[PDB]
Amino acid sequence: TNPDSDPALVDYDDGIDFPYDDPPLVCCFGAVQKEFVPVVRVHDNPMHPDIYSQWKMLQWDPPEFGRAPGGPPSNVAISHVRLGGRAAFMGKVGGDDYGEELVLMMNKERVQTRGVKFDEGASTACTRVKIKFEDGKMKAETVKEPPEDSLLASELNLAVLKEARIFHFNSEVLTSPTMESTLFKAIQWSKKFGGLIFFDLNLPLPLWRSRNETRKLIKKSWDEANIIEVSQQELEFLLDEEYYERRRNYTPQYFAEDFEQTKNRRDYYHYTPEEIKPLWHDDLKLLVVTDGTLRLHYYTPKFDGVVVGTEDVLITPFTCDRTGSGDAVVAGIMRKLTTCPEMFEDQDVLERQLRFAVAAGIISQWTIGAVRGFPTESATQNLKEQVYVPSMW
Amino acid sequence: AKKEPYLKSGQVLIVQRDSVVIRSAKPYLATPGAKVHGHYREILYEGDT
Amino acid sequence: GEDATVDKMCLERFKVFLKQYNEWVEANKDRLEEDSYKYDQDFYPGRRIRGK
Amino acid sequence: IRKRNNPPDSGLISADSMNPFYSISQNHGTIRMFLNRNKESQSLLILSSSNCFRIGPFNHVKYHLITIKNSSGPLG
Ligand SMILES: [Ca+2]
Ligand SMILES: [K+]
């Protein structure tokens, strides 16, 4: 009954004897926010600084890292429920109106907020910082972490962790010393009850500074995640950003080595498992690399491959929004993993079910706002059947 | 042969011991009585008749 | 036949050139190969044979 | 013409930005150019990796004393 104890002695037990209700529960762990795309990098050709009506042009011609941006784990939980699954969110919010509103936001989405703790003496999504002028450059230091980054290990809901067959978290929690300590306890509990660990990187702005520095931080959480989702930019940044850029810019001097190279299409390079060896480990049951919704490069210990997808943000130019697309594809993966255990060891069914995740991401790009337009399961299933020939579904 | 995949349309530009380099070409079927616009080896741009 | 073998030949001016040529080859084998990579992106017939 | 006759000798003081070299401190493709005499001007085409491609390897070539082994090289 002690969340902060070592998950090796007596479990939390309680009076759960009847079978859990299908579909299997999924726990999404971390901060709760609306919108708040974490993956931020420097991009060229900016639009007008003031005229935000022109910024739609960067939605249908997006930065390559922002093709299918991820979000807070709440978006994954909300999108997972709309896909038919059951999701429970674990985190801490303040006692102010926003904390009530955020919890109300997840409650209306049928997301189990029993794992959400309330910090009365805190302001939701509010970080108090001190501005210091160091070496002639203005900087800031986190005086007090927000309640999202202030979930103690003793506040974990073991009932959620025991039922949750998949435990999901982002790399944003790794930017908080309090949450990083709490995360490993939650992972330890989840492994004890048999749940799978899902690691959706979604590297925030600080973690893009250096490859060596970032890999050191990710190292501990990477080695204990059964399922890992990364984007193409994240995967290349972790291995070698410059090397893969040189391959894309390479053009044969005299003639193409094959007919397809003459077409000079977009480079949908499928990384070999040898290039994945530095990031691979024994417990990694599945790794997916998402080039937006265009390519889903999946990797398993037994096999690997790529699932081709599409994107049509231009079909609705005035209501297209890339935000939350990465959450939708992640939620689509967990939706099918909890219902098709054969996926981890059957490549044919792995591609078919991943197309559901592709279709979910496509719909999520057609509406302004992430949680506002997360696709329904029937909407996602219909798009999958329309987009793909019946042999692929 | 049976094992080798099909050859894309074009002209054999380079012949080597094992591999062959092809310059891409697009054949257009023309019936008798048609009028070919342009002399031999004349440069045609996209959209030119 | 036997009287036509190499040991009956002078070839000294050419032999001295071979002595100079071999010395130059050793001191420039690596230097020339690096220049080929630096300037010629892809190997083509007529370019320096490099690599394996 | 005849660079002597260059009032550009005073052109630098006008709107020019030539460096005095005392304080100043991909695309590929072969030329496919031929002379069509009906134009009196040679026309140009570019052969690059977007036009010429390599067909995969296959076996299409079918071959029909005080000395060292024969080796391709100069004779003198
Ligand atoms: Ca992601
Ligand atoms: K959206």
Query: Does the CA dihedral A25-A27-A33-A36 come out positive or negative?
Result: negative
C30 in contact with chain A, both atoms CB, cutoff 8 A: no
Pairing verdict, β A137-144 and B10-15: unpaired
Identify all chain D residues contacting A257, using CB atoms and an 8 Å cutoff.
53-54
Nearest residue to A206 (alpha-carbon basis) of A236, A243, A174, A169:
A174
Name chain D's partners: 3 or more CB pairs within 8 A.
A, B
C42 in contact with chain A, both atoms CB, cutoff 8 A: yes
Long-range contacts (CB closer than 8 Å, 24 or more residues apart) made by A211-220? A211/A237, A211/A238, A211/A240, A211/A241, A214/A238, A217/A171, A217/A174, A218/A171, A218/A174, A220/A184
For A253, the closest chain C residue by CA position comes to C42
Residue A226 CA, ligand 2 centroid: distance in Å: 28
For B39, what's the count of Cα atoms within 13 Å in the CB-facing half-sphere?
Answer: 6
Beta bridge partners of A137: A134
Instruction: Tell me how the structure was determined.
Output: cryo-EM
For A255, the closest chain B residue by CA position comes to B21
Residue that has been written with the tokens 């901060």 in this structure: A31
Q: C47's torsion region: left (phi>0), alpha (psi -120 to 50) or beta?
A: beta
Tell me the C-alpha distance between A256 and A250, whole Å.
11
Identify all chain D residues contacting A248, using CB atoms and an 8 Å cutoff.
none
DSSP per-residue letters across A323-388: TTHHHHHHHHHHHHHTT-GGGGG-HHHHHHHHHHHHHHHHHHTSSSSTGGGPPPHHHHHHHHHHHS
- In Å, what is the CA distance from B37 to each residue of A282, A370, B44, D37? 67, 56, 9, 17
Tell me the C-alpha distance between A322 and A6, whole Å.
41
Tell me the C-alpha distance between A108 and A279, whole Å.
38
Record: contact D28-A262, CB cut-off 8 A: no
Nearest residue to A358 (alpha-carbon basis) of A264, A291, A275, A282:
A291
Task: Report how far apart the first and last C-alpha atoms of chain B are (Å, whole number).
Answer: 37
Ligand nearest to the backbone CA of A331: 1
- Token code pair at residue D17: 């930005």
Residue A197 CA, ligand 2 centroid: distance in Å: 26
C44 in contact with chain A, both atoms CB, cutoff 8 A: yes
Record: contact A252-C42, CB cut-off 8 A: yes
D51 in contact with chain B, both atoms CB, cutoff 8 A: yes
Are the C-beta atoms of A126 and A95 separated by less than 8 Å? Answer: no
Helix (H) or strand (E) segment spanning residue B10: strand B10-15
C39 in contact with chain A, both atoms CB, cutoff 8 A: no
C46 in contact with chain A, both atoms CB, cutoff 8 A: no
* Residues 6+ positions from A206 with CB-CB distance below 8 Å: A175
Of A249, A253, A264, the CB nearest to D28: A253
Are the C-beta atoms of A233 and A239 separated by less than 8 Å? Answer: no
Tell me the C-alpha distance between A40 and A50, whole Å.
20
In this structure, the number of other CB atoms found within 10 A of the CB of residue A111 comes to 25
* Residues 6+ positions from A121 with CB-CB distance below 8 Å: A95
Residue to mutate among A255, A259, A264, A265, with most D CBs inside 10 A, is: A255
D2 in contact with chain B, both atoms CB, cutoff 8 A: no
Helix (H) or strand (E) segment spanning residue A237: helix A232-239
- Token code pair at residue D46: 């570019």
Strand-by-strand arrangement of the A196-200 sheet = A116-119, A86-94, A25-29, A166-170, A196-200, A227-231, A286-291, A295-299, A304-308
Query: Does the CA dihedral D45-D47-D51-D57 come out positive or negative?
Result: positive
Nearest residue to A38 (alpha-carbon basis) of A372, A382, A370:
A370
Residue that has been written with the tokens 């990797």 in this structure: A299
Pairing verdict, β B10-15 and B20-24: antiparallel
Tell me the C-alpha distance between D35 and A193, whole Å.
80
Record: contact A255-B21, CB cut-off 8 A: yes
